[PDB]
Design an enzyme around this catalytic site. Structure first.
Site, PDB file in Angstrom:
ATOM      1  N   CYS A   1     113.719  16.398  -0.532  1.00 25.28           N
ATOM      2  CA  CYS A   1     113.550  17.157  -1.743  1.00 25.28           C
ATOM      3  C   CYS A   1     113.847  16.161  -3.007  1.00 25.28           C
ATOM      4  O   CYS A   1     113.108  15.229  -2.969  1.00 25.28           O
ATOM      5  CB  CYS A   1     114.923  18.094  -1.576  1.00 25.28           C
ATOM      6  N   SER A   2     114.604  16.519  -3.916  1.00 22.97           N
ATOM      7  CA  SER A   2     114.791  15.458  -4.804  1.00 22.97           C
ATOM      8  C   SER A   2     115.963  14.475  -4.577  1.00 22.97           C
ATOM      9  O   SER A   2     115.593  13.361  -4.523  1.00 22.97           O
ATOM     10  CB  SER A   2     115.368  15.968  -6.202  1.00 22.97           C
ATOM     11  N   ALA A   3     117.278  14.688  -4.104  1.00 18.63           N
ATOM     12  CA  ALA A   3     118.044  13.856  -3.679  1.00 18.63           C
ATOM     13  C   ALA A   3     118.001  13.437  -2.327  1.00 18.63           C
ATOM     14  O   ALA A   3     118.353  12.566  -1.618  1.00 18.63           O
ATOM     15  CB  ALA A   3     119.413  14.112  -4.034  1.00 18.63           C
ATOM     16  N   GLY A   4     117.297  14.346  -1.363  1.00 16.43           N
ATOM     17  CA  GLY A   4     117.153  14.297   0.422  1.00 16.43           C
ATOM     18  C   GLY A   4     118.497  14.673   0.801  1.00 16.43           C
ATOM     19  O   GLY A   4     118.689  14.028   2.231  1.00 16.43           O
ATOM     20  N   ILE A   5     119.288  15.416   0.521  1.00 13.63           N
ATOM     21  CA  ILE A   5     120.499  15.791   0.979  1.00 13.63           C
ATOM     22  C   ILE A   5     120.783  17.208   1.117  1.00 13.63           C
ATOM     23  O   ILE A   5     121.395  18.042   2.008  1.00 13.63           O
ATOM     24  CB  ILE A   5     121.786  15.290   0.529  1.00 13.63           C
ATOM     25  N   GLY A   6     120.211  17.986   0.113  1.00 13.62           N
ATOM     26  CA  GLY A   6     120.499  19.376  -0.096  1.00 13.62           C
ATOM     27  C   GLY A   6     119.601  20.330   0.804  1.00 13.62           C
ATOM     28  O   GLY A   6     120.016  20.720   1.840  1.00 13.62           O
ATOM     29  N   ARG A   7     118.543  20.779   0.236  1.00 10.08           N
ATOM     30  CA  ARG A   7     117.529  21.426   0.798  1.00 10.08           C
ATOM     31  C   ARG A   7     117.174  20.637   2.215  1.00 10.08           C
ATOM     32  O   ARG A   7     116.910  21.337   3.222  1.00 10.08           O
ATOM     33  CB  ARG A   7     116.304  21.568  -0.006  1.00 10.08           C
ATOM     34  N   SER A   8     116.777  19.534   2.165  1.00 14.63           N
ATOM     35  CA  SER A   8     116.702  18.722   3.377  1.00 14.63           C
ATOM     36  C   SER A   8     117.644  18.789   4.366  1.00 14.63           C
ATOM     37  O   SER A   8     117.153  19.078   5.604  1.00 14.63           O
ATOM     38  CB  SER A   8     116.624  16.818   2.940  1.00 14.63           C
TER      39      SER A   8
ATOM     40  N   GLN B   1     124.879  20.658  -0.274  1.00 12.68           N
ATOM     41  CA  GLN B   1     125.416  20.508  -1.372  1.00 12.68           C
ATOM     42  C   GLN B   1     126.236  21.345  -2.028  1.00 12.68           C
ATOM     43  O   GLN B   1     126.866  20.995  -2.910  1.00 12.68           O
ATOM     44  CB  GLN B   1     124.254  20.233  -2.293  1.00 12.68           C
TER      45      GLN B   1
ATOM     46  N   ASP C   1     114.512  27.646  -8.610  1.00 11.02           N
ATOM     47  CA  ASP C   1     115.197  26.582  -9.391  1.00 11.02           C
ATOM     48  C   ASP C   1     116.684  26.548  -9.258  1.00 11.02           C
ATOM     49  O   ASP C   1     117.214  25.490  -9.217  1.00 11.02           O
ATOM     50  CB  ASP C   1     114.537  26.788 -10.978  1.00 11.02           C
TER      51      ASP C   1
END
Ligand code: DSJ
Ligand code: DSJ
EC number: 3.1.3.48
Length: 282
Positions: free
Chosen positions: A215-222, A262, A181
Site C-alpha cells: 500500500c503506501s507504507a506497507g503495514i496497514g491495508r497490506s 494501523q 481515502d
C-alpha cells in the site's frame, strides 16, 4: 473466545481501542539498523516504518542491498508474503529487481497512486501497451500485455525481461482500486472477492516465490490482506476452526514486520472479513 461472539462483545462494550492498544504493547521490537543508515534515507518513504534486520529482503547487489521490504513466513499456514512500501521515484528499479530475484508471480496493490490530493506511490508500471518501461539502474524491461478493469479492482498482465540474460516472465498485477481515502470499507464483500481472485491465479501458491503486497507504507491495508488470508487458511486446515485466534496470528505476523494493522478500525474490519469469509468457504 470464538471470533464472531468475541466480536459482538467488543462492539457492545465499545472497547476496540483498548484491544488494539494491547496488541501494540505486546508486539515484538527487533533492530532495524540497516534501514537507518544515512545512505538509505531516500529509500524509505516514512521515517517510522522500517523493516527488521532479521527478516528484510536483500537485493542481490554488492553496492547497496537495501529495500524497505520484509518476508512474513507463516509456518503452520504454509504461506509466505513479502510486504513492502509503495515504490519511490528512486526505488522503482529496486522494486522490480526484488520481484525478479524472489521469483514472485503476483504483485498486490491496495492503494491509488494519488489519494487525499498527494502522491502515495510512484507510477511504477506502464499504462499503454506500446509505451514500455526500462529501468536502467537494474537492467530490466517491463511491458503491459493486457488490462481488465472491473468495478472494484483491475487485473493486469505484465512481461518482465531481465535484459542481461534475455529471460522473460509473466507477472500478474492485482490492483484493488476502491479502498476509501478515509476509514475502511463498510462491507468486506468486495475485499474478499478480490482476495479470492488473487488466490485463484496461483500467485499465493508454493510453486512460486512469495507474493509482493503493498500500500503506501506497507503495514496497514497490506497487513489486513495477509492477516485475513492466513486466518481463513488456518480455519480450513484445523480440526477445530473456532480455535483460530486472530489476535495471536497478528502478533505472530508482527514478529516479521512492525506496525501491521494501523488503526482499531482496521482491526475491526479484519475480524469482519474473516467472519464473513468463513461462511462463504463452506
Ligand atoms: C519459470 C520461472 O522461474 C518464473 C518465475 C516467476 C514468474 N512470475 C514466472 C516464471 O516463469
Ligand atoms: C486477468 C486475470 O484475472 C487472470 C486470471 C488467471 C490467470 N492465470 C492470469 C490472469 O491474469
Amino acid at each position: 473466545m470464538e471470533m464472531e461472539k468475541e466480536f459482538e462483545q467488543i462492539d457492545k462494550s465499545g472497547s476496540w481501542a483498548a484491544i488494539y492498544q494491547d496488541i501494540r504493547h505486546e508486539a515484538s521490537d527487533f533492530p532495524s539498523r540497516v534501514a537507518k543508515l544515512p545512505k538509505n534515507k531516500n529509500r524509505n518513504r516514512y521515517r517510522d516504518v522500517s523493516p527488521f534486520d532479521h527478516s528484510r529482503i536483500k537485493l542481490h547487489q554488492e553496492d547497496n542491498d537495501y529495500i524497505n521490504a520484509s518476508l512474513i513466513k507463516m509456518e503452520e499456514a504454509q504461506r509466505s508474503y513479502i510486504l513492502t512500501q509503495g515504490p519511490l521515484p528512486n526505488t522503482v528499479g529496486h522494486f522490480w529487481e526484488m520481484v525478479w530475484e524472489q521469483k514472485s508471480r503476483g504483485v498486490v496493490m491496495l492503494n491509488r497512486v494519488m489519494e487525499k490530493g498527494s502522491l502515495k506511490c510512484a507510477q511504477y508500471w506502464p499504462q499503454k501497451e506500446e509505451k514500455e518501461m526500462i529501468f536502467e539502474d537494474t537492467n530490466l524491461k517491463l511491458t503491459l500485455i493486457s488490462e481488465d478493469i472491473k468495478s472494484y479492482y483491475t487485473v493486469r498482465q505484465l512481461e518482465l525481461e531481465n535484459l542481461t540474460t534475455q529471460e522473460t516472465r509473466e507477472i500478474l498485477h492485482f490492483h484493488y482500486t476502491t479502498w476509501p481515502d478515509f476509514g475502511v470499507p463498510e462491507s468486506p464483500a468486495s475485499f474478499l472477492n478480490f482476495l479470492f481472485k488473487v488466490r485463484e491465479s496461483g500467485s499465493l501458491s508454493p510453486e512460486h516465490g512469495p507474493v509482493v503486497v503493498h500500500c503506501s507504507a506497507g503495514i496497514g491495508r497490506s497487513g489486513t490482506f495477509c492477516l485475513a488470508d492466513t486466518c481463513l487458511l488456518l480455519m480450513d486446515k484445523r480440526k477445530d476452526p473456532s480455535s483460530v485466534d486472530i489476535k495471536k496470528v497478528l502478533l505472530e505476523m508482527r514478529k516479521f514486520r512492525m506496525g501491521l494493522i494501523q488503526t482499531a478500525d482496521q482491526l475491526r474490519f479484519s475480524y469482519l472479513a474473516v467472519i464473513e469469509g468463513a461462511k462463504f468457504i463452506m
